[PDB]
Amino acid sequence: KVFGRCELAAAMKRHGLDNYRGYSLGNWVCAAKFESNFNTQATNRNTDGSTDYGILQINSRWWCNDGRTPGSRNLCNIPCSALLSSDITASVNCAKKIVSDGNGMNAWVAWRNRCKGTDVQAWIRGCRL
Numbered sequence: 001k002v003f004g005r006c007e008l009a010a011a012m013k014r015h016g017l018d019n020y021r022g023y024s025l026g027n028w029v030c031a032a033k034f035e036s037n038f039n040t041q042a043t044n045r046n047t048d049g050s051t052d053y054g055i056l057q058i059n060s061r062w063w064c065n066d067g068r069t070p071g072s073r074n075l076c077n078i079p080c081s082a083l084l085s086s087d088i089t090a091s092v093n094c095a096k097k098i099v100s101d102g103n104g105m106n107a108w109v110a111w112r113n114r115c116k117g118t119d120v121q122a123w124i125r126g127c128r129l
């Protein structure tokens, strides 16, 4: 599924991602834009053989099982394919674990480089939330 901007904002808010670990909703929407262009089916292969999955490009090194990242963990205890569903519950629940792990949203490269230090509120501007 390719979410609309406000549609995704509403879903993320409903799932309690807004202000989670102190990160306002616009941060998450911005991150999703640049990680996946709001596409739940986004995947990207990393140099090391792991793969990033879903609207927040969660990696199989640590967070999900895809059966093709030897020696990896599955800390969210899900198949990586669960992160590709039209329903963002699994991605959101896993993202909460990630952003709690010490590094905050710096875990998302695209967030650090394209969202951090910017007007992130712009990403939820115009939405009825």
Ligand SMILES: C[C@@H](O)CN1CCN(CC(=O)O)CCN(CC(=O)O)CCN(CC(=O)O)CC1
Binding pocket: 062, 073, 075, 101, 102, 103
């Ligand atoms: C809770 C998360 O931290 C889990 N973690 C996510 C990624 N971490 C991020 C970082 O550690 O800030 C980077 C790699 N991490 C370095 C380290 O832990 O020393 C080694 C593996 N860790 C071991 C552990 O964490 O128990 C498992 C996966």
Ligand SMILES: C[C@@H](O)CN1CCN(CC(=O)O)CCN(CC(=O)O)CCN(CC(=O)O)CC1
Binding pocket: 101, 102
């Ligand atoms: C995998 C280990 O890293 C687990 N870790 C014990 C060993 N770390 C060493 C270091 O962080 O490489 C001690 C310093 N650590 C700083 C930091 O993580 O913020 C304290 C908090 N951590 C929380 C977590 O790691 O996320 C406690 C569990």
Ligand SMILES: [Cl-]
Binding pocket: 003, 004, 005, 006, 007, 008
């Ligand atoms: Cl929308």
Ligand SMILES: [Cl-]
Binding pocket: 022, 023, 024, 027
């Ligand atoms: Cl914030």
Ligand SMILES: [Cl-]
Binding pocket: 024, 025, 026, 027, 120, 121, 122, 124
């Ligand atoms: Cl915001």
Ligand SMILES: [Cl-]
Binding pocket: 041, 042, 043, 044
């Ligand atoms: Cl894909």
Ligand SMILES: [Cl-]
Binding pocket: 049, 050, 051, 060, 066, 068, 069
């Ligand atoms: Cl992989």
Ligand SMILES: [Cl-]
Binding pocket: 053, 054, 055, 056, 057, 058, 083, 091
């Ligand atoms: Cl994701």
Ligand SMILES: [Cl-]
Binding pocket: 065, 066, 067, 068, 069, 070, 071, 072
């Ligand atoms: Cl694997």
Ligand SMILES: [Cl-]
Binding pocket: 068
């Ligand atoms: Cl393969």
Ligand SMILES: [Cl-]
Binding pocket: 065, 078, 079, 080
């Ligand atoms: Cl699995």
Ligand SMILES: [Cl-]
Binding pocket: 011, 086, 087, 088, 089
């Ligand atoms: Cl959803």
Ligand SMILES: [Cl-]
Binding pocket: 021, 103, 104, 105
């Ligand atoms: Cl933080």
Ligand SMILES: [Gd]
Binding pocket: none
């Ligand atoms: Gd770690």
Ligand code: NA
Binding pocket: 021, 022, 023, 104
């Ligand atoms: Na914070």
Ligand code: NA
Binding pocket: 060, 061, 062, 063, 064, 065, 066, 069, 072, 073, 074
């Ligand atoms: Na894995």
